[PDB]
Design a protein around this ligand. Structure first.
Ligand SMILES: CCNc1cc2oc3c/c(=[NH+]/CC)c(C)cc-3c(-c3ccccc3C(=O)OCC)c2cc1C
Ligand SMILES: CCNc1cc2oc3c/c(=[NH+]/CC)c(C)cc-3c(-c3ccccc3C(=O)OCC)c2cc1C
Lengths: 150, 150, 150, 399, 47, 50, 50
């Protein structure tokens, strides 16, 4: 419990000497035991699905619970959690004159949440009747909405 | 500035998928407000050390700080010890040289609040007001007058 | 901000108001309908409460002499005196259950000496109990003071 | 009698005492302001000052900070009563003070103000009380869960038996002013989407710019706007963003004004969304009964809607513990009365003085307005020790 | 035995039925004081 | 006990799966502990009878 | 980097939960050494360069 901690506070005096590709990626100080014990397979018999759909549902319902429960050291997924995946075509990029830097820029702009303020704000005018929170851009949800980025 | 939906998945949810691999735990709860304010509670077993039940939590949270905004990062994130209730509540007023409920809140938090909170094991202090700040109230008519933005 | 064509300087004051005000106007406290701020201290989850409250005054006392004109401390909602009442009304009850026992010891035995042995046989046992709870971990609790009367 | 004087005697945990310090909270309806709730905290300050001079020494109210959470809807007035000597009767003690306070705030008011006791304890262990919670186990949303929680609050107060008292925690559900920015309209005229977002964010809601130094200490610098240019929906079009072609463009160009229903307090339990259900055990039934007649109401709900109990309890005291405690307390008492005695017969004399001293203990508790809490439970165990004492003399000297 | 097995606390009611022991120290010190001393003082000085 | 509570979370998750999703148990330590008590406390009793 | 090996762009929300957004390329334009010259970067003078 203490042999940890110190280690991840020493590591953390060296996080800003690194990339971001790495920083916003999962750094993790954990307790080790070279071996597994319980290994819970997860399959389908009826309503058939793929080795990809199953790995997502395992890590979007049960993996988050298990790992925190009754002192688990570290969990390893046997697959991967879902992600809005994009497969850029280099021929159709040159077709309209474009790069992967312009695609990335379009997602860090339209696929984003903003902190717009609120009507009847924090210091208002004495006598206002209402106070509601402003919404603006919302993070995209489905495959269709990421297909319609400008 | 952020609304309830915004903070629920730009800070709250990120911390929740990185709130694992911790020693001892009964449950985790959470609140996400329209004022742009989130606070999680990780409760532990009875008789557990509060000195170590901390720490781990703020080193797990901190593997998820660079997945967040800056609006939030440079804002005060705080892992602390809880006790749903107050005890000593020290009012601060004026009788002679009269001053405002704004001048007083600043002097309380620019002389005594910094001392109190560190003194003899205080969990967390809550100001009944706010510390001063160089506040600026932009006029949108006089911005368009010289052609300008915030 | 700018320099419009003809050499006219646009300043920050010319486009916006500038007052030294609070960073958060969301809350504002009154004390008997008077303008005020303060400090709502909350416990540190395993702290020594009343000694922590005695040292809240420790810092506050060194701060008193350097206030501006009018600034005075006041004490609403406060736990302290409840502890002072639970010792002074229990150690009082303690002494009432000796004086009372003394009378039952005299009404049955007119021997003054015989109503003395039991009068010293319990003050000593009371004290030994303090020394066991000191050497075990506990405190002078509301519970373990009623246990000295029972 | 010993049985009947015990089962019918109801079970508490700890009494709610006069602590010389109580409090009272405020809460306003859908989207009220600081000016609205301040009128309420003002009316509350009167009851304790003008209509309660003898009992209240001071008040300490706060505008926009409930013990639910935060916002301009809420409030709280901490109270610090006069010393105990100057408050003589039951009338002038917390219970009665918060009684006629709750009447006055339900009489000449038009929102939600209460007053309440200050247990000691912590928040939990009300006894004949519970805290249910309702989870999104599947991939539903807020709109779908809202309805499921409406359906469990309904069926609860639709067949009670031996009634009950159910209610949510603080999900009031108010409107929200959304702004749809069309991206095609923006790029056409030549405006950066970055510039637009920090015009809307650093005007209406503020923005942390930089740190400066006032009078030795370092504080913050914030940027927003005068209040008069951000109080209504029509004031959005007064903000003119600049385009790349050096000409001004209003918000009315690319914006779209329209209201929408959301929530000002999204709660989540254990990595998934949730809503709190603060109910209270019936005045007839009690807890173990009420909670188990709430689990069959949550399994009758639709798909992808589970449940779990925050946060009540982890197995109680006059509940399932008390037994186990007494149980062993016997098996030792009898043994040790054999380590100094030998029979068998001697213990069974001492081992039924138990109900002698007990029927009296219950009589006084059941008779006066007291109950089986903690202090009473150990008043019992004290007396099996004092009955053994007395009896053991009857048995020791005689044998 | 009436006291300390009952003082095997269960959860949030930890130091509640637990803090007997407080009691029991008093019982075993009343035994001590009565096995020592009270014997002494009686002999030492009575009638 | 950590493996007993792996099933604790997993058990509350069972009822809300889609159609077809079923749990299975390969590589698992649990039953080796159950064999080392039931074949030792058995041996215990054999060394009394004997 | 964001074609051959992927790049962490941003976070989105699928079905309530927040997951990640990755950017790379179809497999068929990054399997051999000859496929590097099919990627045309843009220059400041608005014309493509392989
Ligand atoms: C002259 C006879 N000397 C004694 C010397 C002792 O030295 C100790 C050293 C230690 N070294 C540092 C690792 C620690 C941890 C505990 C000790 C206890 C102790 C152990 C179990 C339960 C309570 C206590 C105890 O005394 O608790 C409260 C005082 C102790 C007790 C007595 C009688
Ligand atoms: C006819 C007299 N009416 C009463 C009416 C009451 O209404 C209440 C409404 C509530 N509204 C929803 C926000 C909440 C939260 C608690 C209440 C309690 C309560 C408050 C403090 C400590 C314990 C309890 C309490 O009774 O706990 C277990 C039952 C209460 C108690 C009495 C006597």
């Amino acid at each position: 419990d203490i042999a940890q901690v110190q280690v991840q506070a020493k590591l953390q005096l060296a996080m800003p000497l690194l990339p971001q590709e790495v920083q916003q990626q999962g750094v993790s100080v954990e307790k080790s035991s070279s071996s597994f014990l319980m290994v819970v397979g997860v399959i389908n018999t009826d309503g058939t699905m793929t080795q990809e759909d199953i790995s997502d549902y395992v890590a979007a319902n049960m993996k988050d619970a298990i790992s925190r429960t009754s002192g688990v050291g570290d969990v390893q997924l046997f697959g991967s959690q879902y992600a809005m995946r994009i497969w850029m075509n280099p021929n159709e990029l040159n077709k309209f004159q474009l790069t992967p830097v312009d695609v990335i820029t379009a997602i860090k702009a339209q696929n984003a949440q903003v902190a717009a303020g609120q009507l009847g704000g924090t210091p208002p005018v004495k006598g206002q009747q209402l106070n509601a929170s402003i919404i603006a851009q919302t993070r995209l949800t489905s495959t269709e909405e990421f297909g319609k980025i400008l | 500035g952020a609304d309830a939906k915004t903070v629920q998945d730009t800070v709250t949810q990120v911390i929740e998928q990185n709130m694992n691999g911790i020693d001892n735990l009964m449950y985790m709860s959470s609140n996400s407000d329209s004022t742009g304010t989130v606070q999680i509670t990780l409760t532990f077993e009875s008789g557990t050390d509060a000195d170590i039940a901390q720490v781990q939590v703020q080193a797990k949270l901190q593997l998820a700080m660079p997945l967040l905004p800056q609006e939030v990062q440079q804002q005060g994130v705080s892992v602390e010890k809880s006790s749903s209730s107050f005890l000593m509540v020290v009012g601060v007023i004026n009788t002679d040289g009269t001053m405002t409920q704004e001048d007083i809140s600043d002097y309380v938090a620019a002389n005594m609040k910094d001392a109190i909170s560190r003194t003899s094991g205080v969990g967390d202090v809550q100001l009944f007001g706010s510390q001063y700040a160089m506040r600026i109230w932009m006029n949108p008519n006089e911005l368009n007058k010289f052609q300008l933005t915030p | 901000l700018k320099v419009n064509q003809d050499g006219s300087r646009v300043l920050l004051r010319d486009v916006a108001k500038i007052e030294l005000g609070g960073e958060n106007y969301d809350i504002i406290a009154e004390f008997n309908g008077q303008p005020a701020s303060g400090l709502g201290i909350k416990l540190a989850t395993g702290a020594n409460a009343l000694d922590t409250a005695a040292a809240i005054r420790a810092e506050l006392a060194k701060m008193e002499p350097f206030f501006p004109s009018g600034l005075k401390i006041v004490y609403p909602y406060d736990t302290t005196p409840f502890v002072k009442i639970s010792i002074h009304e229990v150690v009082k009850t303690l002494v009432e259950a000796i004086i009372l026992v003394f009378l039952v010891m005299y009404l049955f035995l007119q021997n003054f000496r015989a109503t003395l042995i039991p009068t010293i046989a319990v003050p000593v046992v009371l004290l030994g109990t303090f020394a066991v709870l000191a050497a075990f971990g506990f405190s002078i609790n509301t519970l373990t003071m009623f246990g000295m009367v029972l | 009698g010993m049985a009947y004087l015990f089962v019918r005697l109801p079970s508490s945990f700890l009494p709610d005492e006069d602590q010389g310090v109580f409090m009272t909270m405020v809460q306003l309806p859908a989207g009220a302001t600081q000016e609205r709730t301040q009128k309420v905290l003002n009316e509350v300050t009167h009851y304790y000052l003008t209509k309660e001079k003898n009992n209240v020494e001071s008040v300490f109210a706060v505008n926009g900070f409930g013990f639910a959470g935060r916002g301009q809807n809420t409030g709280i007035a901490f109270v610090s009563l006069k010393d105990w000597a100057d408050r003589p009767g039951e009338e002038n003690k917390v219970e009665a003070i918060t009684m006629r306070a709750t009447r006055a705030f339900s009489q000449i008011k038009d929102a939600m103000v209460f007053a309440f006791n200050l247990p000691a304890i912590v928040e939990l262990g009300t006894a004949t009380g519970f805290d249910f919670e309702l989870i999104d186990q599947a991939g539903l949303g807020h709109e779908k869960l809202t309805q499921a929680r409406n359906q469990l609050l309904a069926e609860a107060a639709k067949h009670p038996d031996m009634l009950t008292s159910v209610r949510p925690n603080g999900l009031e559900d108010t409107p929200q002013f959304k702004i749809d920015i069309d991206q095609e309209k923006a790029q056409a005229l030549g405006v950066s989407i970055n510039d637009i977002n920090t015009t809307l964010g650093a005007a209406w809601g503020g923005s942390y710019v930089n740190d400066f130094i006032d009078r030795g200490r370092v504080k913050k610098v914030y940027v927003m706007s005068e209040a008069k240019y951000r109080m209504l929906p029509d004031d959005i079009g007064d903000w003119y963003v600049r385009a790349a072609d050096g000409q001004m463009v209003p918000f009315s160009a690319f914006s779209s004004s329209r209201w929408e229903y959301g929530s000002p307090r999204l709660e989540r339990y254990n990595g998934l969304p949730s809503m709190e259900i603060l109910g209270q055990a019936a005045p007839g039934k009690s807890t173990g009964e009420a909670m188990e007649l709430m689990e069959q109401l949550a399994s009758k709900l639709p798909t992808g809607v589970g449940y779990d109990w925050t946060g009540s309890y982890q197995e109680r005291l006059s509940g399932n513990q008390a037994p186990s405690l007494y149980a062993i307390s016997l098996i030792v008492v009898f043994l040790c009365l054999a380590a100094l005695y030998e029979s068998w017969s001697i213990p069974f004399s001492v081992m039924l003085v138990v109900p002698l001293g007990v029927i009296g203990a219950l009589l006084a508790a059941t008779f006066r307005g007291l109950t089986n809490d903690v202090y009473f439970q150990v008043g019992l165990l004290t007396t099996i020790g004092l009955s053994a004492k007395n009896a053991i003399l009857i048995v020791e000297f005689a044998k | 035995a009436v006291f300390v097995p009952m003082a095997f606390f269960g959860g949030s009611t930890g130091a509640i039925y637990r803090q007997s022991i407080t009691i029991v120290s008093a019982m075993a010190l009343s035994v001590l004081v009565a096995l020592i001393l009270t014997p002494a003082l009686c002999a030492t000085m009575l009638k």
